[PDB]
Amino acid sequence: GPLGSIDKETIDLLAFTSVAELELLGLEKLKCELMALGLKCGGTLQERAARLFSVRGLAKEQIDPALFAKPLKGKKK
C-alpha cells in the first residue's frame, strides 16, 4: 500500500474495475484518468476503457515508468 499496514490485502480482486460503468457517465473522466496514468488520453474508445479497466488493484505508484508518455514539465513534452 502507501505506508504502514495500509494495503488492499486482497488475493485476487473479485470486484473488477469495470470502467464500462464510468464510460456510460461521460468521456472527460476517462480522458483525465488516462492522463493521470501518464497517457495523452488518446487511443481508441476501446483503448481508453481497457487501460483503465486493467488498472485493477494498481495504485498510482504502481504505474509503469515507461507507460508515462504524457507531456509534462520536462518529460515527454
Side-chain angles (χ1 to χ4, degrees):
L3 183 64
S5 308
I6 302 177
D7 189 275
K8 300 293 175 174
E9 305 179 286
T10 306
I11 302 174
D12 184 73
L13 285 63
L14 299 177
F16 295 95
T17 313
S18 37
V19 295
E21 299 177 75
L22 302 179
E23 193 284 293
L24 300 176
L25 282 260
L27 186 62
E28 178 181 89
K29 182 181 176 69
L30 283 291
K31 285 177 180 178
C32 186
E33 195 67 287
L34 295 170
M35 293 183 61
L37 293 178
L39 298 176
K40 300 179 181 178
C41 63
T44 55
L45 197 294
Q46 184 178 30
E47 257 297 299
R48 299 179 168 153
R51 201 68 55 204
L52 299 184
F53 177 90
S54 300
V55 82
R56 176 185 172 238
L58 297 178
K60 301 302 298 298
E61 298 185 273
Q62 299 179 30
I63 303 175
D64 193 273
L67 197 168
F68 187 84
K70 183 181 65 180
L72 183 62
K73 299 176 298 185
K75 183 181 299 184
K76 294 293 183 179
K77 183 181 174 299

